[PDB]
């Protein structure tokens, strides 16, 4: 029936390497700040366009700012202007910068930066102080040596014999952060139609210095 599968980690690593040319090598969703479905929903609801985002017809009949009739509240003579309130500020904080935010979605806040040191040389030890890491600039109730505490003979570290790392340790650690479906080791079978190859490509920020037609 070709319904479900369960691969091995070397297989997954080889397949990931082969598919490399179709994947953006992103480890976090911080890239998509104010560029995710929730931000787009909020922009559509508020009838505004993120610089690189889509643009729809007004969801609700837009309020004309030339209709309001200079109350005490909207008296322009009390405002203090330092920086223009761009659309991004309102999209980020919908309830503080907008009047009548309806059907507006709250956008996920920061997610802690993932600091994963991709390995470029496969000959190095799995656990290695890569030059990218900032150095640790070196510089206590200890009992005396003359003390008599003595461990029994049988006792020793739990896995002394087991090697610290093997030839497929860095590969597994990389697979931990590979994008879906390359972070799995089992699953179901999809349809060739149901697999889109460039959705991640057009969900990203457009590369700089592109023509207007491709931007649109």
């Amino acid at each position: 029936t070709y319904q479900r599968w369960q691969f091995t980690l070397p297989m997954m690593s080889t397949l990931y390497r082969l598919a490399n040319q179709l994947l953006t090598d992103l480890v976090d969703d911080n890239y998509f700040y104010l560029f995710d479905l929730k931000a787009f929903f909020t922009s559509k609801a508020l009838n505004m366009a993120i610089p690189g985002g889509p643009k729809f017809e007004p969801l609700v009949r837009d309020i004309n700012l030339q209709d309001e009739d200079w109350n005490e509240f909207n008296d322009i003579n009390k405002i203090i202007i330092r920086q223009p309130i761009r659309t991004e500020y309102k999209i980020a904080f919908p309830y503080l910068y907008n009047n009548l935010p309806h059907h507006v979605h709250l956008t996920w806040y920061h997610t802690p930066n993932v600091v994963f040191i991709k390995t470029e040389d496969p000959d190095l030890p799995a656990f290695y102080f890569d030059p990218l890491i900032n150095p640790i600039s070196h510089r206590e109730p200890l009992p005396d040596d003359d003390e008599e505490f003595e461990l029994p003979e049988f006792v020793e570290p739990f896995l002394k014999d087991t090697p610290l790392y093997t030839d497929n340790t860095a590969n597994g650690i990389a697979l931990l952060w590979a994008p879906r479906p390359f972070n799995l080791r089992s699953g179901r079978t999809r349809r060739a139609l149901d697999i889109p190859l460039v959705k991640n490509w057009y969900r990203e920020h457009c590369p700089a210095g592109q023509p207007v037609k491709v931007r649109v």
């Binding site: 030339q66 309001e68 009739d69 200079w70 109350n71 005490e72 008296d75």
Partner: protein, 223 residues
Amino acid sequence: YLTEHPDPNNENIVGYNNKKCWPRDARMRLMKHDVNLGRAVFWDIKNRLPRSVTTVQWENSFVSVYSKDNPNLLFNMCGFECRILPKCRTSYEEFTHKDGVWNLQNEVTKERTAQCFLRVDDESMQRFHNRVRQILMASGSTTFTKIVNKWNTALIGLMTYFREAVVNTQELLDLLVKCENKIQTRIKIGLNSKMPSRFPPVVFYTPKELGGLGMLSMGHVLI
């Protein structure tokens, strides 16, 4: 007024009529004191006349306040829309000669003290547009000369009544050109069922006694 009609929610601003034709900074600005004063004055006036003999209704009235907050005094009279702005207050600027502005100057010392800006009431605009619509609809099986005579009469009436206000009003000029183009299109449709291109203006604008329709123009037609 507030003792008679207490207002805890500051709701006296919800239904206030304002002259939407002017820009925001030219309209009346709704301050608490000014809004309350206008409502109080209207209430005091409406108290005098009994309900039986006749009634004064707020929805169809308009009360405008000039004070330390509002520098413009607005009103509508005889189909005009006049706005008076003092020279001392919120002018701070030199003035050239615009067509729709009257230079109200003190009569004893002969000093420019205020300026009155004029416009044509939106009601008058709508009445003229409906007059043109009636001319077109009732045109039916009538004659080109009669259509042009109706247009000339309407335009002369409007232009001789609202002399400077028409120039001051930027919407009435567009309305005039639209109606004139509609009339010309009616004549052309009567001439033939297929729209031409670059139709000559001589037929329309030539005097009647010389064989033309003697049409009166109010736009910028380039021969």
